[PDB]
Design a protein around this ligand. Structure first.
Ligand code: HEM
Ligand code: HEM
Ligand code: 08Y
Ligand code: 08Y
Lengths: 461, 461
């Protein structure tokens, strides 16, 4: 009955099927689906994830109304996502007043003073990463980036969050390593999540039985592990997220269960994200020696003879920033952004009923010919001081936008840049024979390459 | 995963869809679906009602193996049908040893001695039907057959079962009339039954909450009504099903709840069936004056000057029997017959795994060009002594076949014939302007005409 909504409002889209709505259209993944629909329906289309109506918008003004203008009043929350348990209190899952409160309590965590203080910790692991990478370089076997960057992502996360200093790559069997690395982003296209989309009525049944998409084993270890590194350990001032969160309950307020839910979500949100992007960047660099050479030239020029990177020097590297940005354009890992209309609204011309998920298809927008010349091409120059004025911040949205944008944006940029600097100071990266060209994306619900990125690593003396 | 079954066995059929299986193919009803599939897959095809695999067979030998040969050992039961409650003990729904026991206890009910004893009761209402029909005839407004035959069906059922003598047509507000006539055959194509097919896992949930497809209001009235006409009434020897059922517990055995479940199922099975067929017969007769004239000539010849029909005279009317049979050929109301394989089996060449519903598509078989010359044509002669040897009893199956065939077959034939005799002794039937020609069947899950049959009635003096 909800399947006549877009018909009633006179909005075009793919004709839904009883029960399934439009989900069979996901056979080629989210990105493709969004590309095809944009191409054939233009600026706005409507579709159904089961019985849930989703309105895709592509108009920059419209997008700002949703993400910025009407955030607090109408578009405050993401779609509710499944059986969730105690993780319901995680910032990214929280709603309305719960969210606003957690956002407030957690903002001061990601400030530049706190961030500049985090530099010497996250640098210590630029060194470890080099060390590991060279061990593969002088033995000379084509490297798997996700493995080495994955290892790197975790090391910085553990240490910056809790202070659990561990070489995850060489310690694969470490109890903290086994738990955390299980925490991977959800494929909303897998069988179980498709079942939840078609039968959302089953969610409360799952919630009552303490079933939750976050593996109970993982969340338990940490649940009572954080308990040790507060009461058994830190009960006596260190530089990490946990402290910044401990002292914050020490004046609002923050319960014990909430605090762990945030610690978990910083990993789940932070871990695969940082390493997928760092892996995509290297791919482009390896397939574009000119851009790599030039980046290495900017790095040696700024930090001569392998000087260590600092907060101020990172911000000073223009081409570095251009390369990170162009990569995010091609591979914005979120693919889509989403808000639910709490109430009925009329955004710039069109009426949107309560409960409709309004979706911004970031990937299709990033690769749109009507905003981007040769948008399949990797062209850092797009982002140079001269060109980067012709870039709409609501067409280009790798970190979302508005009050509910990526909270860890600054931290993530900084982290990746530091990783990239140390690595490029010591090594060059070249295509192996197993390297797939062009790169192919997983037809799954995740923006990742269909085969893992394998690259040849060579020292620079 | 069950959707690769027919692929694995190398059996052809329509490719199923995730979850839905093949149910969208029912958009034109059961009969059409079965016709199309036969035409395009030949002798055997496989399809999925949701996740339930159904094997259609059309080979007469094969059909006899299922319906007759392997009934007791392998093909004992129909598919389980939904939330059912106390009606689980109704003969037509019962399984294995429960069924075999009820079949036994109820066989002696439908014998010809009992049946010949039922004649004077069921005749009393041939008279009532004439009386009502004439009231419409001399006022001269085109009659709706279902209404008058419906009324007739019930009158004979109530009286033959319980002894509740009521002119249902002129007593539409009678408390026994309002209850019973709500009891109509299930449309397995309506929304609720489609939901149960796609989510059969919900059935036990429904059963626990005492939800049941037989309306609780209806089943309750009778439940405690039968209680009155046993203890308050018959506790003191009459000719009816109830008695035949009362004395049978008076020697195996029969519980109180069972007895009512059978009383209900004789109505639900008997009521719409008798009147749908009686309505289809009149349609053919009205659209074929030659056949009507001839039938009336056989009736006057056997029962001169309006003599009342008897058991022996009914059996004596060949053309009558030919007309009833030809109509059932065109409109076998069951459309399909079904058995579930209790275990794995290998019927004459092909292997059939446990749980597969094996289905005989009676309607398509009745209208098959390879067994029937001009099978769309209404040609009683098909069934004359000379031709009726060329008729396979497993191609032609209006009352099913084997140990689980229609238990009320003899009673139903007799009842319809008596109705037809009295009616044709007094009246002729002619097409109105609202009469649709040719007749169109409901695209629903029931074999009924898309518009109700309206015919002009005229006295014969
Ligand atoms: C390349 C790396 C990263 C990318 C591309 C990324 C991207 C995004 C995007 C697109 C959103 C959606 C915001 C919206 O709805 O508009 C988001 C939200 C979020 N990100 Fe990130 N992110 C990254 C790294 C991180 C890290 C390292 C953290 C934690 C330290 C983090 C924590 C979050 C949180 C908590 C939210 C939800 C904020 C809220 O709803 O209140 N992210 N991110
Ligand atoms: C024109 C009228 C009727 C037709 C065409 C008809 C047809 C059928 C058919 C095709 C079956 C399926 C048997 C099988 O699976 O092979 C059946 C079963 C049955 N019929 Fe009828 N029927 C009619 C009237 C009646 C009446 C009047 C009664 C009750 C007095 C009745 C009671 C039953 C019962 C109880 C079964 C199930 C037997 C069992 O499973 O043990 N039917 N009928
Ligand atoms: C999933 C939550 C718990 C994690 C949170 C987070 O903390 N992240 C930070 C970096 C990445 C980001 C996140 O994973 O990615 C985010 N979003 C998602 O993962 C979106 C959420 C979806 C979803 C949730 C529940 C039921 C569903 N049925 C279907 Br079909 C989908 C779906 C599609 C799916 N879309 C397209 C992606 C944003 C960037 C938009 C998100 O909210 N993330
Ligand atoms: C339904 C039961 C309780 C009544 C019993 C009966 O007592 N009848 C006597 C005369 C008619 C006959 C009956 O109604 O008709 C019978 N059969 C049916 O009504 C069949 C049963 C079906 C069914 C049951 C449960 C779930 C389902 N999902 C789907 Br898709 C279907 C379905 C299709 C449907 N088919 C094709 C018809 C026979 C003649 C075959 C039957 O068993 N009847």
């Amino acid at each position: 009955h909800s399947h006549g909504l877009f018909k009633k409002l006179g909005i075009p889209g793919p004709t839904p099927l009883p029960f399934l709505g439009n989900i069979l259209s996901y056979h080629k993944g989210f990105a493709m689906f969004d590309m095809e629909m944009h191409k054939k329906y233009g600026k706005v289309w409507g579709f159904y994830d089961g019985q849930q109506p989703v309105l895709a918008i592509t108009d920059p003004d419209m997008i700002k109304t949703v993400l910025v203008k009407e955030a607090y009043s109408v578009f405050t929350n993401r779609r509710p996502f499944g059986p969730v348990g105690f993780m319901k209190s995680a910032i990214s899952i929280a709603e309305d007043e719960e969210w606003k409160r957690l956002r407030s309590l957690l903002s001061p965590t990601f400030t530049s003073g706190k961030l500049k203080e985090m530099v010497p910790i996250i640098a210590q692991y630029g060194d470890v990463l080099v060390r590991n990478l060279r061990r593969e370089a002088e033995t000379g076997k084509p490297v798997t980036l996700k493995d080495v960057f994955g290892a790197y992502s975790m090391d910085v996360i553990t240490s910056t969050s809790f202070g659990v200093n561990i070489d995850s790559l060489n310690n694969p069997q470490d109890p903290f390593v086994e738990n955390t690395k299980k925490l991977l982003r959800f494929d909303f296209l897998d069988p179980f999540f498709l079942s939840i989309t078609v039968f959302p009525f089953l969610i409360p049944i799952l919630e009552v039985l303490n079933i939750t998409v976050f593996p109970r084993e993982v969340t338990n270890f940490l649940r009572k592990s954080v308990k040790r590194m507060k009461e058994s350990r830190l009960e006596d001032h260190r530089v990490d997220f946990l402290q910044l969160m401990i002292d914050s309950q020490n004046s609002k307020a923050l319960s014990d269960l909430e605090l762990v839910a945030q610690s978990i979500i910083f990993i789940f949100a932070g871990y695969e994200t940082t390493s997928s992007v760092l892996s995509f960047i290297m791919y482009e660099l390896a397939t574009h020696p000119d851009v790599q050479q030039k980046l290495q030239e900017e790095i040696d020029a700024v930090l001569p003879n392998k000087a260590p990177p600092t907060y101020d020097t990172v911000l000073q590297m223009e081409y570095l920033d251009m390369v990170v940005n162009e990569t995010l354009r091609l591979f914005p890992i979120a693919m889509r952004l989403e808000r639910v209309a709490k109430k009925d609204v009329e955004i710039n011309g069109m009426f949107i009923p309560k409960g409709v998920v309004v979706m911004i298809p970031s990937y299709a927008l990033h690769r749109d010919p009507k905003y981007w010349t040769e948008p399949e091409k990797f062209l850092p120059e797009r982002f140079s001081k001269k060109n980067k004025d012709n870039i709409d911040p609501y067409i280009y949205t790798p970190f979302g936008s508005g009050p509910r944008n990526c909270i860890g944006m600054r931290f993530a940029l900084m982290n990746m840049k530091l990783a990239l600097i140390r690595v490029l100071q010591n090594f060059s990266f070249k295509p192996s024979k197993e390297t797939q060209i062009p790169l192919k994306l997983s037809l799954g619900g995740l923006l990742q390459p269909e085969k893992p990125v394998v690259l040849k690593v060579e020292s620079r003396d």
